[PDB]
Amino acid sequence: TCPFYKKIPGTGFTVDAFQYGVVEGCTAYFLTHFHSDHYAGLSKHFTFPVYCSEITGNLLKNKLHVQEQYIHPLPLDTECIVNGVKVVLLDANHCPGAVMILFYLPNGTVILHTGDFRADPSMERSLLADQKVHMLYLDTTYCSPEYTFPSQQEVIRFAINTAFEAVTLNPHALVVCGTYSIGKEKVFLAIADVLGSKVGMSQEKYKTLQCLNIPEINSLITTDMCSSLVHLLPMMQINFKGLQSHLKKCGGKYNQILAFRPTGWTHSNKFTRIADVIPQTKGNISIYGIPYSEHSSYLEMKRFVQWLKPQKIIPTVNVGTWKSRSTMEKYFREWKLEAGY
Ligand code: NI
């Protein structure tokens, strides 16, 4: 059964609600982004209207085989009418194709559903500038002040400088980057650009990347592993055993691996600056954990909400424990008292 924080009242609509069977009263299913916890339940046998971005609809058709007649892609930043209700899709600064959804209810209530997002001051000059929001359905993944991490630009600067130094010292070093979903593509793209290489990967990952509307992508990626010195591997293989095994397969072309595991937040963030980050090393293999986040930090979240001034907040993450719920409610009231709304 579909939980209340996935339903939009006063409409026939649900958000990220594909794992509950036929939801009673649902006339249109929205999908914010192509991450498995959110698309869980979709497949080629789905026969209700799915509303999403262009990029998400490429992934639904090619990767999950959803039939074309049920995929309804909407342009971003554009007022659209869906089953009698005005909606807008906005860029969520999450993974490729990820959106927030503005719903203009027939009674005059305005609802923002963030999906998954990384809040940014640039959102203060989107179509959100123009009107009041009554209800906020909020990605609360990192809603506690201990969750700090650097800008994506600082993290990419560290990765590029680290990879370029290693491979210039040793032209026979291979770089490997872990992946298990879409998102975080700038990590491997930026490193391959500084090294003058295409990125090598499996046919299944190449397929996925070809759905993302990335400019000049044919110039940037390949399935010919032998021609490339930056390889993508599943995240599960980013350990000493998996990497050893991979280096054997390369036929003595390489004699060292430098590997990156983009994580979200980890508790080594509480003590170390990005500049000071060191790898785990065994023999000729080194593994860096890098805190590349596609969700808001505590401070980015708090700024966005204090700017938007919603009348009510409904969290969409960390909703399963009383302690998490009570913590989030306390911070919402602090923010409201500090800012005066
Ligand atoms: Ni996500």
Helix/strand/coil (H, E, C) string of 226-281? HHCCEEEEEHHHCCHHHHHHHHHHCCCCCCEEEEEEEECCCHHHHCCCHHHCCCEE
User: Do 299 and 217 contact (CB within 8 A), yes or no?
Assistant: no
What spacing in Å lies between the alpha carbon of 302 and ligand 1's midpoint?
19
User: Strand pairing of 285-291 and 280-282?
Assistant: antiparallel
What spacing in Å lies between the alpha carbon of 52 and ligand 1's midpoint?
14
What spacing in Å lies between the alpha carbon of 141 and ligand 1's midpoint?
10
What spacing in Å lies between the alpha carbon of 107 and ligand 1's midpoint?
31
What spacing in Å lies between the alpha carbon of 33 and ligand 1's midpoint?
7
What spacing in Å lies between the alpha carbon of 76 and ligand 1's midpoint?
18
* C-alpha 29 chain-centroid distance: 20
User: Do 54 and 34 contact (CB within 8 A), yes or no?
Assistant: no
What spacing in Å lies between the alpha carbon of 285 and ligand 1's midpoint?
30
What spacing in Å lies between the alpha carbon of 246 and ligand 1's midpoint?
29
Q: Experimental method used, please?
A: X-ray
What spacing in Å lies between the alpha carbon of 34 and ligand 1's midpoint?
7
What spacing in Å lies between the alpha carbon of 173 and ligand 1's midpoint?
33
Per the DSSP assignment, residues forming a β-bridge with 243 are none
Q: How far apart are CA 228 and CA 222, in angstroms?
A: 8
Tell me, in Å, the resolution of the deposited structure: 1.4
Q: Identify the DSSP state of 151.
A: -
Residues 6+ apart with CB under 8 A from 124: 304, 307
Residue labelled with tokens 């997002």: 117
What spacing in Å lies between the alpha carbon of 250 and ligand 1's midpoint?
33
What spacing in Å lies between the alpha carbon of 171 and ligand 1's midpoint?
36
What spacing in Å lies between the alpha carbon of 316 and ligand 1's midpoint?
12
What spacing in Å lies between the alpha carbon of 182 and ligand 1's midpoint?
9
User: Do 111 and 288 contact (CB within 8 A), yes or no?
Assistant: no
What spacing in Å lies between the alpha carbon of 53 and ligand 1's midpoint?
14
Cβ neighbours of 107 (radius 10 Å):
6
What spacing in Å lies between the alpha carbon of 98 and ligand 1's midpoint?
8
What spacing in Å lies between the alpha carbon of 284 and ligand 1's midpoint?
34
What spacing in Å lies between the alpha carbon of 181 and ligand 1's midpoint?
9
Residue whose C-alpha is closest to residue 296's, from 11, 159, 93:
93
If DSSP codes are grouped into helix, strand and coil, which group holds residue 134?
Answer: coil
Q: How far apart are CA 12 and CA 49, in angstroms?
A: 12
How many Cα atoms within 13 Å fall on the side-chain side of residue 294?
23
For 169-174, the CB contacts below 8 A with 24+ separation are 170/255, 170/256, 172/253, 172/254, 172/255, 172/256, 173/254, 173/255, 173/256, 173/257, 173/258, 174/229, 174/231, 174/247, 174/250, 174/253, 174/254, 174/256, 174/257, 174/258
Q: How far apart are CA 4 and CA 195, in angstroms?
A: 49
What spacing in Å lies between the alpha carbon of 116 and ligand 1's midpoint?
5
What spacing in Å lies between the alpha carbon of 194 and ligand 1's midpoint?
28
What spacing in Å lies between the alpha carbon of 94 and ligand 1's midpoint?
7
Residues 58, 63, 64, 67: what is their CA dihedral angle, to the nearest 10 degrees?
Answer: 50
How many Cα atoms within 13 Å fall on the side-chain side of residue 143?
28
User: Do 233 and 257 contact (CB within 8 A), yes or no?
Assistant: no
What spacing in Å lies between the alpha carbon of 175 and ligand 1's midpoint?
26
Q: How far apart are CA 26 and CA 6, in angstroms?
A: 11
Instruction: Write phi, then psi, for 96 (nearest 5 degrees).
Output: -60, 135
Q: How far apart are CA 44 and CA 47, in angstroms?
A: 8
Task: Sketch out the chain's domains with CATH numbers.
Answer: 1-147+296-341 (3.60.15.10), 148-295 (3.40.50.12650)
Q: How far apart are CA 213 and CA 53, in angstroms?
A: 12
Both structure tokens of 89: 């899709």
